[PDB]
Design a protein around this ligand. Sequence first.
Ligand SMILES: Nc1ncnc2c1ncn2[C@@H]1O[C@H](COP(=O)(O)OP(=O)(O)NP(=O)(O)O)[C@@H](O)[C@H]1O
Ligand SMILES: Nc1ncnc2c1ncn2[C@@H]1O[C@H](COP(=O)(O)OP(=O)(O)NP(=O)(O)O)[C@@H](O)[C@H]1O
Ligand SMILES: [Mg+2]
Ligand SMILES: [Mg+2]
Ligand SMILES: [Mg+2]
Ligand SMILES: [Mg+2]
Lengths: 258, 258
Amino acid sequence: PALTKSQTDRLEVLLNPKDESGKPFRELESELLSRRKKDLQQIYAEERENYLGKLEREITRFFVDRGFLEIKSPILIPLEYIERMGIDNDTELSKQIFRVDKNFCLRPMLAPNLYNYLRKLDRALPDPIKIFEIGPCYRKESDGKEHLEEFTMLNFCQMGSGCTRENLESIITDFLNHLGIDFKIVGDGDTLDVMHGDLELSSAVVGPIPLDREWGIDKPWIGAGFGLERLLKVKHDFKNIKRAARSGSYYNGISTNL
Amino acid sequence: PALTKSQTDRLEVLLNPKDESGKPFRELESELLSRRKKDLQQIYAEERENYLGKLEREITRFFVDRGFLEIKSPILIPLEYIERMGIDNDTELSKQIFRVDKNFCLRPMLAPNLYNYLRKLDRALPDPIKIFEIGPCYRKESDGKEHLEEFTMLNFCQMGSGCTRENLESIITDFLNHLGIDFKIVGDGDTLDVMHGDLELSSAVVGPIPLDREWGIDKPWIGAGFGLERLLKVKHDFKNIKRAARSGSYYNGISTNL
Ligand SMILES: Nc1ncnc2c1ncn2[C@@H]1O[C@H](COP(=O)(O)OP(=O)(O)NP(=O)(O)O)[C@@H](O)[C@H]1O
Ligand SMILES: Nc1ncnc2c1ncn2[C@@H]1O[C@H](COP(=O)(O)OP(=O)(O)NP(=O)(O)O)[C@@H](O)[C@H]1O
Ligand SMILES: [Mg+2]
Ligand SMILES: [Mg+2]
Ligand SMILES: [Mg+2]
Ligand SMILES: [Mg+2]
């Protein structure tokens, strides 16, 4: 008769964005199951590349080509960096942190080590210094429609000449027109927000900023952080952020429970 | 006069593999410091790519081209997977584990999720099933000349037809001749060891294996795990594994303390 809520939830899991009443649950399920099996078969026959990995690689050629240096820093950082990042029980990120042992934790962001790389590289590189990093980041979350506790972050930045907000926005714009993601910047050192509809695609800043001193920076800098899973959720039009996440439940948005 | 042990340790840090008595410490230090600064400047002027990332990308094109499916699974896995992997206080890996909260931990290896992917994909993919994954792995270690507590693992495998040890060795051999790494396999289901001199480059297995059942496998399979940092330490001839690790201390083997 009418599909139950549970059968609906099930059919949605097998339902891809691009898909388009009458038959019972058993057949509708069977129709989707063969469709999904066919998609996986096609992926395996030709492409064989994972979305996350593919994006990370396209994002990387993008910044490397535009002159940024590719950084791969630790994911398991000293807990101290969280304090030194100006994150006390004052902010939300306070408990959002996955503590490992007593002296470590899971980098909830890329800033700490990108700061370190800027201080150190200034002693050897011409102006301006341009660097980026793409990688695993962690934050405990209560929601789960746009938040994953384990996700991938892209953080790029420049220090020295050219660190103007006109330029920061120009990188943000070339970037996203390259990926093919509609966006809107919103602001008023500075703090911008790159939004996709009601979804935060990125928060960027134009420094210097007071914190800069705690890391030994002291120069003008520009920069921004984007979530790879969110860029994916937009590009592929997935209803839930889970379809673009590292998972044992979906591959390139296709359910693995067939 | 004679260099102290400390000055020596310092000069070694600035010393690259390819470099080749007389002057005092101050000048020798100054000579190396400009050399390193020049290398970083060259990297930044032309390449701009990180070793780890670059390797991961070359390894990836390799397996994808040879028909393997690229997997990106979670790094923060359920603690249960460690028990189900047959790791009790019986083995060394018992305490080598970084526990996160009470139900999680840091994947000390790729097996758990590759097993899951094999069970699930069998329901949709032709024979044989070929998949791989490259990514962060964690184990507490006492040593540190060939062991990093945070490192990168490459795990590839096949299930079904063709899972012969003659084939496993053939993949291992094409792989390494492609990267340009001298090696030697040593064995006698099976367990092989790919060594570089006295260094373990990889441990491989030819299943089925008894464990296979706990993950719902039940088919013949072949496979192996390599450390990206170790492959790097060999290719670039770094004296210590720290030079190829994710770090705030070295970039492509060049010290960042200039
Ligand atoms: N849990 C998450 N899952 C996916 N992406 C995230 C997550 N947390 C942050 N990001 C991304 O990181 C960039 C923003 O960083 P940040 O300013 O730390 O987020 P926030 O301010 O925590 N945003 P929000 O969680 O929506 O209130 C954007 O690309 C976000 O999509
Ligand atoms: N801590 C580590 N640092 C770098 N590579 C590692 C580390 N642990 C394992 N590997 C790599 O993973 C592959 C072997 O996996 P595994 O069999 O778990 O190592 P093991 O048996 O722990 N070897 P070992 O630590 O030398 O006694 C090889 O490529 C190793 O170089
Ligand atoms: Mg938040
Ligand atoms: Mg924000
Ligand atoms: Mg060991
Ligand atoms: Mg071994």
